[PDB]
Write a protein that binds this ligand. Structure first.
Ligand code: SF4
Ligand code: SF4
Ligand code: F3S
Ligand SMILES: [Mg+2]
Lengths: 267, 534
């Protein structure tokens, strides 16, 4: 799987929906083929790898124990209730897998709000005791760079990896361990509807003429004022983002957003 | 080398989510199977007590592969509960985004999830690109030259020579494998198109974001309609249309020809992985309250009796837990559903999965493309009949061939082709509606204190239903019954094997250390375990 040359990435899937992996497939300039053939060596990834079963497990072992070192990218929260049994791969708990692998990585990136902060399965009443990577593994000294969102902008993953490869260090991180170069501004301070907010020009309903005219979505629940992300600037898929589609921000790059930002249609 | 004994595949890769397949093999053929889903999240538990308007945002995170589908199902469910009839344009926009999702999902499935079960990428290095180009040009109206394919070979050679095989590390085909049949040239064509599809899928997904904000996890649906006033503009419509046209061209000129070339080479795969019973919910409505207004109609078939398609009765669905990691043994209709986790470890008390086992009139039902296609065919759907008949004729097989792993894989392509064309019809209808002066995209509604609702989506993997009981204006109960739950759930309290389990009986295994035949069948169902368990 890897030896010298391209840096090795081990990508792990815990309690996740695979939306974060799908977001990486949307990479643009560079595209995912460039990333996997030229930039990096993707040495374990359950969604796309050829090997299955015992051969997949052997691929993982080969990558993790390589003398060349690896970077870990982690998708999903870690279920910790009941000694980890709510999530297993190859009959090992996700908790055990990550506890064994992540301390061996040269660097760890927690990709998506589930891996960063616990995410959707950690919302009340959290039946599986899901935790974000740094919370679950604090005791082992794991300090993953957190790239939040549900899913994040893949621009933010690639940018973080490129930085790390060039500088051999993490970029500047905020108090939630997120890179300031992507997460330094609120969604709201970047939003094209900000002049309507300032004027108290709010859409009262989605069917309203005010909504049709593009008035501010705050009365309809927009969490842009309390959410750190680069959505209005970079957009998604090179073309759109929630408020430009007429829908409030739901706060998806913030910790505990499922409980903190709900009801989604109120402020 | 005719093996007897167990085989375990854990993880099953090139699916969404966390699946363990166990089989017993006798004299080289599978005689028994278990489908074990090994992650639980508990979204139904999490939803209790919340605002019904919030459900779609949580449930969309059931799955990012079949992104949008659960948002659509939850919004249809709450729409239904509150009795709102969304505007025509909201139906059009929601339908167009769903059509786009089908094209994205199926293209990625065939190339990026399924094809490495049949394509030896490393054998492409031995190929003669000139011969390969001649073959590629004979199967598609898109002409391909030797230099086109040599560029792919050169890139692959550099990659392989680095000794860092990445996602091909320990592939079942490395070194050769008796169950891998393609010649070098066909392997090169498929590998070239695998790589092409990595960039084409960017466009296919972008089509969803044009109206739907972003992919993954769209953000344009509300109870009562959609939010995207920009979707009415000629500029956004034109943007969508261009992405759709390019995606459709890839379906027609790249995917379907490759599907047919591979199927022809693997025609023995008509003999494995059949199933008995089929369920489908229909999709692409004209009327949100009438499933028979959908472009594909609902139906139920038992024991392959396509002359006697039964109506779909939503009250005949029950979800079993006897062989699942939940409390007790009592099957429940989803309006009376229960999600009470109780883990017993593998085969503890005869339980082996986090999926429930949905049964329709007590029977295990395959859902997904094969169900959609076969039921539509049998209802006289003219587009499905035209494409299916042309596929059969090209392969030189009769209709009985469809009841197989090969058949299921072909059906996925058929549905893709038919939906790709129908997106254009929906798009024209939408344009015509705007031109009549209808600019409405959302309708007002009121939350009842007590209600029941259900939403139905035929998603890329089949019949999806979301079920709500509203109590005091909050979520009293919310139950998801998801396509992969039907297909890949375990046995029920009558001990009936699920579709995937049944379909594996009879699978030949040439090399138990590299059991690609199991993967071929399992992957033909396009498993989504986050979906199946939630
Ligand atoms: S962060 Fe969101 S998109 Fe990513 S795995 Fe979690 S639920 Fe899915
Ligand atoms: S729509 Fe949301 S992010 Fe934009 S100005 Fe209003 S509150 Fe801020
Ligand atoms: S919902 Fe998430 S994707 Fe951006 S606009 Fe709000 S942080
Ligand atoms: Mg369910």
């Amino acid at each position: 799987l890897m030896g010298p040359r391209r840096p090795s990435v081990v990508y792990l899937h815990n309690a996740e929906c695979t939306g974060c992996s799908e977001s990486v497939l949307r990479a643009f300039e560079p595209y995912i083929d460039t990333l996997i053939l030229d930039t990096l060596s993707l040495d374990y990834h359950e969604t796309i790898m050829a090997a299955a079963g015992d051969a997949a497990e052997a691929a993982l072992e080969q990558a993790v124990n390589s003398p060349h070192g690896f970077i870990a990218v982690v998708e999903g929260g870690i279920p910790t209730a009941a000694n980890g049994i709510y999530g297993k791969v190859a009959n090992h708990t996700m908790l055990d897998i990550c506890s064994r692998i992540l301390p061996k990585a040269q660097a760890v990136i927690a990709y998506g709000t589930c891996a960063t902060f616990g995410g959707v399965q950690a919302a009340k009443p959290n039946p599986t005791g899901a935790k974000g990577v740094n919370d679950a593994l604090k005791h082992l000294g794991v300090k993953a760079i957190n790239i939040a969102g549900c899913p994040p902008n893949p621009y933010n993953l690639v940018g973080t990896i490129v930085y790390y490869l060039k500088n051999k260090a993490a970029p500047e991180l905020d108090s939630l361990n997120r890179p300031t170069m992507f997460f330094g501004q609120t969604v709201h301070e970047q939003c094209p509807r900000l002049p309507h907010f300032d004027a108290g020009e709010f859409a009262p309903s989605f069917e309203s003429e005010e909504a049709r005219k593009g008035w501010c979505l705050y009365e309809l629940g927009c969490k842009g004022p309390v959410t750190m992300n680069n959505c209005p600037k970079i957009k998604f898929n090179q073309t759109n983002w929630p408020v430009d589609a007429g829908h409030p921000c739901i706060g998806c790059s913030e910790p505990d957003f499922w409980d903190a930002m709900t009801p989604f249609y109120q402020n | 080398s005719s093996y007897s004994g167990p085989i375990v595949v854990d993880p099953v890769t090139r699916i969404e989510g966390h699946l363990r397949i166990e089989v017993e093999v006798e004299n080289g053929k599978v005689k028994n199977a278990y489908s074990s889903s090994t992650l639980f999240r508990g979204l139904e538990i999490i939803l209790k007590g919340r605002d019904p308007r919030d459900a779609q945002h949580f449930t969309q995170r059931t799955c990012g592969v079949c992104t949008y589908t659960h948002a659509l199902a939850s919004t249809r469910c709450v729409d239904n509960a509150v009795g709102v009839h969304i505007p025509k344009n909201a139906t059009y926009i929601r339908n167009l985004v769903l059509g786009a999702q089908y094209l994205h999902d199926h293209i990625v499935h065939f190339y990026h999830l399924h094809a490495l079960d049949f394509v030896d990428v490393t054998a492409a290095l031995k190929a003669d690109p000139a011969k390969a180009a001649k073959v590629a040009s004979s199967i598609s109206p898109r002409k391909t030259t030797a230099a086109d394919l040599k560029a792919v070979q050169d890139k692959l050679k550099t990659f392989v020579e680095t000794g860092q095989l990445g996602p091909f590390t320990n592939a079942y085909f490395l070194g050769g494998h008796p169950a891998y049949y393609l010649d070098p040239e066909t392997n090169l064509i498929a590998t070239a198109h695998y790589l092409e599809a990595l960039r084409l899928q960017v466009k296919a997904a972008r089509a969803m974001a044009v109206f739907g904000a972003k992919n993954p996890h769209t953000q344009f649906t509300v109870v009562g309609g959609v939010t995207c006033y920009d979707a009415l503009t000629p500029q956004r419509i034109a943007e969508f249309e261009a992405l759709w046209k390019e995606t459709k061209a890839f379906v027609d000129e790249v995917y379907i020809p490759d599907l047919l070339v591979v199927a022809a080479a693997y025609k023995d795969w008509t003999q494995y992985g059949g199933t008995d019973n089929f369920i489908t919910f229909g999709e692409f409505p004209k009327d949100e309250y009438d499933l028979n207004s959908r472009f594909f109609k609902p139906g139920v078939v038992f024991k392959r009796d396509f002359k006697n398609i039964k109506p779909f009765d939503k009250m005949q669905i029950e979800e079993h837990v006897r062989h699942s990691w939940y409390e007790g043994a009592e099957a429940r209709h989803p309006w009376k559903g229960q999600t009470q986790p109780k883990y017993t470890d593998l085969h503890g008390d005869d339980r082996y999965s986090w999926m429930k086992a949905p049964r329709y009139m007590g029977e295990p039902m395959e859902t997904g493309p094969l169900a959609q296609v076969l039921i539509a065919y049998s209802q006289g759907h003219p587009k499905v009949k035209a494409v299916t008949d042309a596929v059969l004729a090209k392969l030189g097989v009769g209709p009985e061939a469809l009841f197989s792993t090969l058949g299921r894989t072909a059906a996925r392509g058929i549905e893709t082709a038919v939906i790709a064309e129908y997106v254009g019809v929906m798009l024209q209808e939408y344009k015509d509606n705007i031109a009549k002066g209808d600019n409405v995209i959302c309708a007002p509604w009121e939350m009842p204190k007590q209600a029941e609702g259900v939403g139905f989506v035929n998603a890329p993997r089949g019949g999806l239903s979301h079920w709500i009981r509203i109590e005091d204006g909050k979520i009293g109960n919310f139950q998801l019954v998801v396509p992969s739950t039907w297909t890949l759930g375990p046995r029920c309290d009558k001990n009936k094997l699920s579709p995937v389990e049944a379909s594996l009986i009879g699978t030949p295994v040439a090399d138990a250390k590299r059991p690609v035949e199991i993967l071929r069948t399992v992957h033909s169902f396009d498993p989504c375990i986050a979906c199946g368990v939630h």
